[PDB]
Each structure stands twice: as C-alpha cells, then as structure tokens.
C-alpha cells in the first residue's frame, strides 16, 4: 500500500510518497534539517502532520526541484496535504479550514516597456 501527492509553489514542484511508519523523512536523499538551514521551513513542512497529529505514524519519501527554498517548502507542504487527503479524505474539512488545501497562485510579474521594474517608472522630470 502507498499514497501519493503533488505540490507546487512559485516555480517549484514536488513529489510526495507517504507510508505507514515511525515518522522518518528524507528529502532528495537528505534529512529535512540537512536540506534546510532555516528553522522556519521545518515546521512549514511538518504543519499538516501536526494538525492531524499524524507525526509518528507515517514515513515520508520526498523529491523536489525548482524554485527556491521557500517555494520548495510550500510545495512540499501542499503535496503532503494532498497525500493525506488521499490516505483519508475525511481530513479534507479541517485541512481546508487550516488553509492547506488551497493552491497559492501568486507569481512574479513580467517587466514592461518603459518600466525598470514591474510597476516601477523613472522619476518625473518635473519640468
């Protein structure tokens, strides 16, 4: 038996496999802390298990690529949420109330002509 989830955030994407186990996790063949110096990312990724108190019952195998550390973290969180819904759909209601189910769509905006940044324009001459 096994269950799967796919997550995305900014330019990143992640594949998540979840299985009954004592709670060990690996990301790109590295431990979570080895893959993330910043202390925030670790909760950011573990919050779904905390929310349903599953932390010690499922083992995780993770592969992720694209985007930065923050985007990856978000992608993994989303993937874990989906994986959990596959495992037990009754979790859907509380997972949505937590806001974990929603696909954040915010992405960078393209530069435009005459603007040295998206919505940034040179100082007025004031003549």
């Amino acid at each position: 038996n096994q269950y799967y989830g796919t997550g995305r955030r900014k330019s990143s994407a992640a594949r998540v496999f979840i299985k009954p186990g004592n709670g060990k996790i690996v990301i790109n063949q590295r431990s979570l802390e080895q893959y993330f110096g910043r202390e925030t990312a670790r909760m950011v990724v573990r919050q779904p298990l905390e929310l349903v108190d599953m932390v010690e019952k499922l083992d995780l195998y993770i592969t992720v690529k694209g985007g930065g550390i923050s985007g990856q973290a978000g992608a993994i969180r989303h993937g874990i949420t989906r994986a959990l819904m596959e495992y037990d759909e009754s979790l859907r209601s509380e997972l949505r109330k937590a806001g974990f189910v929603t696909r954040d769509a915010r992405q960078v905006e393209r530069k435009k002509v005459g603007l040295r940044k998206a919505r940034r324009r040179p100082q007025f001459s004031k003549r």
Binding site: R38, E39, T40, M43, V44
Partner: protein, 140 residues
C-alpha cells in the same frame, strides 16, 4: 480612497511561538526582505531578555510592549474644507503598530555594539517603563 476602502492584509503567526504579534514585530524589523536576519535578531534579543529581565519570553515582550502602547493621537482630518488637528482615540491595532514602530526606531538609535543588544536594552527599559517608546507615546 475616493471610490473605495478595503481591510488590512492577513499574516501568518510566528512559527516558533504561534503569535501573530511577534510575526508583525519581525516584519517591522525586517529590511530588504532579509527576514531570516530579522528573526534571528528578534529571537536572540527576546532570549537574552527572558534570561535577564522578567520571568518568561513572550510574556516579557508583551508586558514591555504594554508599558508603551499609545492611546490617542492628533493626526488630521479636514472634512470641513479646513484642516483639523483633532485628538482622536486610536484603534488597538494601530496602538500596537505605533508602539512597535517606536521601539524599533529607538533601538536603531541606542547605539550598542549589536542590534540584538540594542533591542534587548530598549525592551528591558520598556519593561521598566524607561524605554523611550514611552516618551514617543507621551509627546503625542
């Protein structure tokens, strides 16, 4: 604005302590999007505060802030076609925001060897009601 008005934006709770107020604090302290630097500074300052001033960390922070919160300001409205320098009671959100802004602005000035140290000193004084954010309240 002329056509419309809208509510303020939601923010996450602090991931270490679960308080949104502390997250707002780190945001006002943040510069150039270096959030990790700001949060390291804030965590170290609160840690040294708890071990040297007060009994507990988040509680020490909250009491130091409470010793400072302004209630009233004179910032203007003009509906009559002429400017009002009218004293008006302040919403709690703005109370906290003004207090936080003032304390960080003072820490920038205090001038100790490091920002975590400046911040801890200002905050310890604020818990002692001597942190000059009290003065920034009092002048208003």
């Amino acid at each position: 604005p002329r056509r419309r008005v809208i509510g303020q934006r939601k923010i996450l709770p602090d991931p270490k302590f679960g308080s949104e107020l502390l997250a707002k604090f780190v945001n006002i302290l943040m510069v150039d999007g270096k959030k990790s630097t700001a949060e390291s500074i804030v965590y170290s300052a609160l840690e040294t505060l708890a071990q040297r001033s007060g009994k507990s960390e988040l509680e020490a922070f909250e009491v130091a802030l409470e010793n400072v919160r302004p209630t009233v300001e004179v910032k203007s409205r003009r509906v009559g076609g002429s400017t009002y320098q009218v004293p008006v009671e302040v919403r709690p959100v703005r109370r906290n925001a003004l207090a936080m802004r003032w304390i960080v602005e003072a820490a920038r000035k205090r001038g100790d060897k490091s920002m975590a140290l400046r911040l801890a000193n200002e905050l310890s004084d604020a818990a002692e009601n001597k942190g000059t954010a009290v003065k920034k309240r009092e002048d208003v």
